């Protein structure tokens, strides 16, 4: 029981680390998409002003 | 199963895995328990390479501020009434393991502010001395 | 098993590093796509302005 | 102001000392920057394993995040420590003997 | 398989599915009740081309138990590994039944309503068939809105919060949320202000939407003004949180809100920083160790943004205007004389008259009898601190105050009721006395 509980706890801790990494990656990807949209909008505005 | 005085004493080696975020809470809980001796695996490096070296310096500054506060209390014969309360805290730690708290930065800022009033009180003492010198001139009379 | 637990911890650290690397790669791809879309938008705006001048 | 400070000066000093001890223990304890921090080994009696697990579980419950916290027992040829179970009336004898 | 999956997979969000996965399962009672069609019973047995018939059977039925069974089946199929792709394709290929499915939801008991909402969200989570208008219509249902607003069942509140956070993935849907924010936004604010795995979802998933909603600078600027107290609470909970993820999300939200892209952002951020005394908190956070590289970047960005306070402090014109203004907030500009000799030089003007006018104004305000108010007490403390700084700035100011009678009035009023006001007045008197004997 105790060694089985220890093994289950180790698997759970590995899963928790994986979940933290996945959540951080998802947040980073969403933030990167938003930043890319903002940068594209700014660059498009600058180019339009240049060609206007 | 616990062992008493019968033969060359008992001990064991164990590795404790803990999450990063709950490190402070786990350390406080272990210290309140006080039933482990962590091997100095990270102490093979020099003290200048300590992970909490900057935090150690901040704690040292807080300790210096507390020493200055104690010096002021002695200089004004303060009763240090919290000494009675400190005994309960030691008893509380030995019995129920109260949480340490994450307000350490708040106490650090409070210590800096206390040092501010300490400097203010020193300036007040200097002004009082100057006034005492000024009072000597008041003795002048025809 | 304790040894299996340590191996799982190492594998979890590796997986976390892989996820962080994937996030960084996604950020780089987002920046590159933003630059490409900016160039495309500049071309589209220039084409629209040229078409408007011809209409005028 | 001094009297008000004295009302909690000793308590604040004790808390600061406890925090400093915790930081010193952490510095001696093994840790990593990129990886999940607070991973290390140490010494502990076999009899205290269950109590340590229960206290760790209670701390995890009191923790703001559901993160498991347990320990692992591993073999090592480095010499272990020695701990004498000191009853209230045999601690003096043990100290005299081990001096 | 499929486009994606629901984030909420713990606590009651899975317990309800587990309880309903076998309670009168397979809908075999339809063979005896005769209320349901044979095709519905066959579909239930198989799931224990078929997308439309199941939806029609669920919509046309009126039995509560049958409705709960149908909702459970729909949620399972949406979450099914071997049927998620099929459901996503059915939604994408023929979104016509999606509106009927949404109409089917938001009905029945609490568990059935939650299951139907989860199924609908999973249906709408696909990369296609956004149906922003349909999403808004589903957001207007009384049952779901009340369930999300109510937090009596913390598991139900967590499920609703996770569903709302998952729904905010679509930027097109995101803009819809801010317009309809007022219905449920401060419910999350109350949840955030009050603050096992349930708490993590309430602390991490809820903040995820705030970071997502902050992506629109116009929406962020609109939301900031109506929730200043919530903004201060978020600033506090940024460091109050124990888990690193919550702190990182809060820091990201704060940085996004403070970004100059918002209207009056360069002014709103400065106003918020001085109002809540966020500079010491930022310094303490920077002193603390960062467990995330993104957290370190956010801390560096906050430290850089803290230069706005320094810029405000150096604005001697701003400090002079605030002194002329009827109110002073003890901002970093209140330390301009200590920050730079420029403030002292400006106050020296007109033979100490720039400072004398402010001193007379403070004396009149003290004689006005309104200083007993707590806000007025803070203003009076700021005025006393300014007078103390002026006295040590130059003996000419002390001479002017003595001539104008302001110094005598301050000495008389040194026994202020407020402890902070009393300390400030004592400091001012000591500065005046120290120069008097010098």
Swiss-Prot record, chain C:
Does the entry annotate any disulfide bonds, and if so which pairs? none
Q: Which GO terms describe its molecular function?
A: ATP hydrolysis activity; proton-transporting ATPase activity, rotational mechanism
Subcellular location as annotated = Vacuole membrane
Q: Does the keyword Acetylation apply?
A: yes
Q: What does this protein do?
A: Subunit of the V1 complex of vacuolar(H+)-ATPase (V-ATPase), a multisubunit enzyme composed of a peripheral complex (V1) that hydrolyzes ATP and a membrane integral complex (V0) that translocates protons. V-ATPase is responsible for acidifying and maintaining the pH of intracellular compartments.
- The protein's assembly and partners: V-ATPase is a heteromultimeric enzyme composed of a peripheral catalytic V1 complex (components A to H) attached to an integral membrane V0 proton pore complex (components: a, c, c', c'', d, e, f and VOA1).
Misc. comment: Present with 2280 molecules/cell in log phase SD medium.
What protein name does the entry list?
A: V-type proton ATPase subunit G
Species annotation:
Saccharomyces cerevisiae (strain ATCC 204508 / S288c) (Baker's yeast)
Q: Which region of the full protein is contained in this chain? A: 2 to 57 of 114
UniProtKB/Swiss-Prot annotation, chain D:
State its location(s): Vacuole membrane
PTM comment: the record says: Glycosylated.
What family name appears in the similarity comment? Belongs to the V-ATPase 116 kDa subunit family.
Q: How does it assemble?
A: V-ATPase is a heteromultimeric enzyme composed of a peripheral catalytic V1 complex (components A to H) attached to an integral membrane V0 proton pore complex (components: a, c, c', c'', d, e, f and VOA1).
The UniProt function text for this chain reads: Subunit of the V0 complex of vacuolar(H+)-ATPase (V-ATPase), a multisubunit enzyme composed of a peripheral complex (V1) that hydrolyzes ATP and a membrane integral complex (V0) that translocates protons. V-ATPase is responsible for acidifying and maintaining the pH of intracellular compartments. Is present only in vacuolar V-ATPase complexes; enzymes containing this subunit have a 4-fold higher ratio of proton transport to ATP hydrolysis than complexes containing the Golgi/endosomal isoform and undergo reversible dissociation of V1 and V0 in response to glucose depletion.
Q: Supply any other comment.
A: Present with 55714 molecules/cell in log phase SD medium.
Protein name per the record: V-type proton ATPase subunit a, vacuolar isoform
Organism field: Saccharomyces cerevisiae (strain ATCC 204508 / S288c)
Taxonomic classification: Eukaryota, Fungi, Dikarya, Ascomycota, Saccharomycotina
Q: Which gene encodes it?
A: VPH1
* Whole-protein residues included: 298 to 396 of 840
From Swiss-Prot, chain E:
Q: Which domain of life is it from?
A: Eukaryota
Pfam families given in the database record = V-ATPase_H_C, V-ATPase_H_N
The cellular component terms of Gene Ontology attached to this UniProt record, alphabetical and capped at eight, are: fungal-type vacuole membrane; Golgi membrane; proton-transporting V-type ATPase complex; vacuolar proton-transporting V-type ATPase complex; vacuolar proton-transporting V-type ATPase, V1 domain
* Changes seen on gene knockout: Increases the ATPase activity of membrane-detached V-ATPase V1. Abolishes growth at pH 7.5 and in the presence of calcium chloride, abrogates growth at pH 5.0.
Keyword list, A-Z:
Hydrogen ion transport, Ion transport, Membrane, Transport, Vacuole
- Listed InterPro entries: ARM-like, ARM-type_fold, ATPase_V1-cplx_hsu, ATPase_V1-cplx_hsu_C, ATPase_V1-cplx_hsu_C_sf
Give the matching Gene3D superfamilies. Answer: Leucine-rich Repeat Variant, V-type ATPase, subunit H, C-terminal domain
How does it sit in the bilayer? Peripheral membrane protein
A GO biological-process term: vacuolar acidification
One GO MF term attached to the UniProt entry:
proton-transporting ATPase activity, rotational mechanism
Its annotated compartments are: Vacuole membrane
Q: What does this protein do?
A: Subunit of the V1 complex of vacuolar(H+)-ATPase (V-ATPase), a multisubunit enzyme composed of a peripheral complex (V1) that hydrolyzes ATP and a membrane integral complex (V0) that translocates protons. V-ATPase is responsible for acidifying and maintaining the pH of intracellular compartments. This subunit is essential for activity, but not assembly, of the enzyme complex. This subunit is also required for silencing the ATPase activity of V-ATPase when V1 is detached from V0.
Question: What more does the entry say?
Answer: Present with 22500 molecules/cell in log phase SD medium.
- How does the record describe its quaternary structure? V-ATPase is a heteromultimeric enzyme composed of a peripheral catalytic V1 complex (components A to H) attached to an integral membrane V0 proton pore complex (components: a, c, c', c'', d, e, f and VOA1). Interacts with YND1.
Q: Which family does it belong to?
A: Belongs to the V-ATPase H subunit family.
**Protein known as:** V-type proton ATPase subunit H
Source organism per UniProt: Saccharomyces cerevisiae (strain ATCC 204508 / S288c) (Baker's yeast)
Gene it is expressed from: VMA13
């Amino acid at each position: 029981l105790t060694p089985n509980q220890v093994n289950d706890e180790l698997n759970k801790m590995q899963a928790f680390i994986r979940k933290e990494a996945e959540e951080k990656a998802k947040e980073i990807q969403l933030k990167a998409d938003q930043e890319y949209e903002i940068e594209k909008t700014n660059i498009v505005r600058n180019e339009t002003n240049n060609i206007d | 199963k616990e062992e008493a005085i019968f033969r060359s004493a008992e001990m064991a080696l164990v590795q404790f895995y803990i999450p990063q975020e709950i490190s402070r809470d786990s350390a406080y809980t272990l210290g309140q328990l006080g039933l482990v001796q962590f091997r100095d695996l990270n102490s093979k490096v020099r003290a200048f390479q300590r992970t909490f070296v900057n935090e150690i310096r901040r704690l040292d500054n807080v300790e210096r501020q507390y020493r200055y506060f104690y010096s002021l209390l002695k200089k004004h014969d303060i009763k240090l009434y919290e000494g009675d309360t400190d005994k309960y805290l030691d008893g509380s730690g030995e019995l129920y393991v109260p949480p340490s708290g994450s307000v350490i930065d708040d106490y650090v800022r409070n210590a800096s502010y206390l040092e501010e009033r300490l400097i203010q009180m020193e300036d007040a003492t200097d002004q009082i001395e100057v006034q005492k010198n000024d009072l000597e001139q008041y003795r002048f009379i025809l | 098993s304790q040894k299996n637990g340590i191996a799982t911890l190492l594998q979890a650290e590796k997986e976390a590093h892989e996820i962080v690397s994937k996030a960084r790669k996604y950020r780089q791809d987002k920046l590159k796509q933003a630059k490409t879309d900016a160039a495309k938008e500049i071309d589209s705006y220039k084409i629209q302005k040229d078409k408007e001048l011809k209409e005028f | 102001e001094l009297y008000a400070i004295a009302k909690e000066l000793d308590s604040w000093f004790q808390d600061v000392t406890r925090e400093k001890a915790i930081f010193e223990i952490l510095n001696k304890s093994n840790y990593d920057t990129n990886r999940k921090i607070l991973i290390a080994e140490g010494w502990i009696p076999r009899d205290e394993l269950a109590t340590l697990q229960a206290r760790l579980g209670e701390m995890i419950a009191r923790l703001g995040i559901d993160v498991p916290s347990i320990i692992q027992v591993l073999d090592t040829n480095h010499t272990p420590p020695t701990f004498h179970r000191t009853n209230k009336f045999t601690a003096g004898f043990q100290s005299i003997c081990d001096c | 398989m499929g486009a994606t999956k629901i984030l909420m997979d713990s606590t009651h969000f899975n317990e309800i599915r587990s309880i309903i996965r076998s309670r009168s399962v397979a809908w075999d009672a339809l063979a005896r009740s005769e209320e349901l069609s044979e095709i519905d019973a066959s579909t239930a047995k198989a799931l224990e081309k078929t997308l439309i018939p199941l939806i029609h059977l669920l919509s046309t039925s009126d039995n509560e138990d049958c409705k709960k069974s149908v909702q459970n089946l729909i949620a399972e199929l949406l979450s099914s590994d071997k049927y998620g792709d099929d459901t996503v394709k059915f939604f994408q290929e023929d979104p016509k039944q999606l509106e009927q499915l949404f109409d089917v939801s938001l009905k029945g008991d609490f568990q059935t309503v939650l299951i139907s909402g989860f199924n609908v969200v999973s249906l709408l989570v696909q990369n296609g068939l956004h149906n922003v208008k349909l999403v808004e219509k589903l957001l207007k249902n009384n049952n779901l809105i009340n369930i999300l607003q109510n937090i009596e069942q913390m598991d139900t509140c967590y499920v609703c919060i996770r569903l709302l956070q998952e729904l905010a993935v679509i930027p097109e849907y995101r803009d819809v949320i801010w317009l309809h924010e007022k219905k449920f936004m401060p419910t999350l604010f109350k949840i955030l202000q009050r603050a096992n795995h349930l708490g993590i979802q309430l602390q991490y998933h809820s903040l995820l939407l705030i970071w997502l909603l902050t992506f629109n600078p116009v929406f962020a600027n609109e939301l900031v003004q109506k929730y200043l107290s919530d903004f201060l609470d978020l600033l506090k909970l940024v460091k109050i949180t124990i888990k690193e993820k919550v702190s990182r999300l809060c820091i990201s939200i704060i940085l996004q809100c403070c970004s100059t892209r918002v209207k009056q952002h360069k002014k709103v951020i400065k106003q918020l920083l001085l109002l809540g005394n966020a500079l010491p908190t930022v310094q303490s956070l920077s002193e603390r160790k960062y467990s995330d590289e993104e957290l370190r970047q956010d801390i560096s960005n906050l430290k850089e943004i803290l230069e706005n306070e320094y810029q405000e402090l150096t604005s001697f014109d701003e400090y002079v205007a605030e002194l002329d203004s009827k109110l002073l907030c003890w901002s970093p500009p209140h330390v301009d004389n200590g920050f730079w000799s420029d403030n002292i030089d400006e106050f020296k003007k007109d033979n100490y008259k720039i400072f004398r006018q402010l001193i007379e104004l403070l004396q009149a305000k003290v004689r006005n009898g309104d200083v007993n108010a707590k806000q007025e007490k803070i203003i009076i403390q700021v005025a006393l601190n300014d007078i103390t700084h002026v006295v040590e700035l130059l003996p000419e100011s002390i001479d002017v105050l003595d001539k104008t009678g302001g110094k005598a009035d301050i000495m008389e009023l040194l026994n202020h009721s407020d402890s902070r006001v009393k300390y400030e007045a004592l400091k001012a008197t000591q500065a005046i006395i120290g120069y008097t004997f010098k």
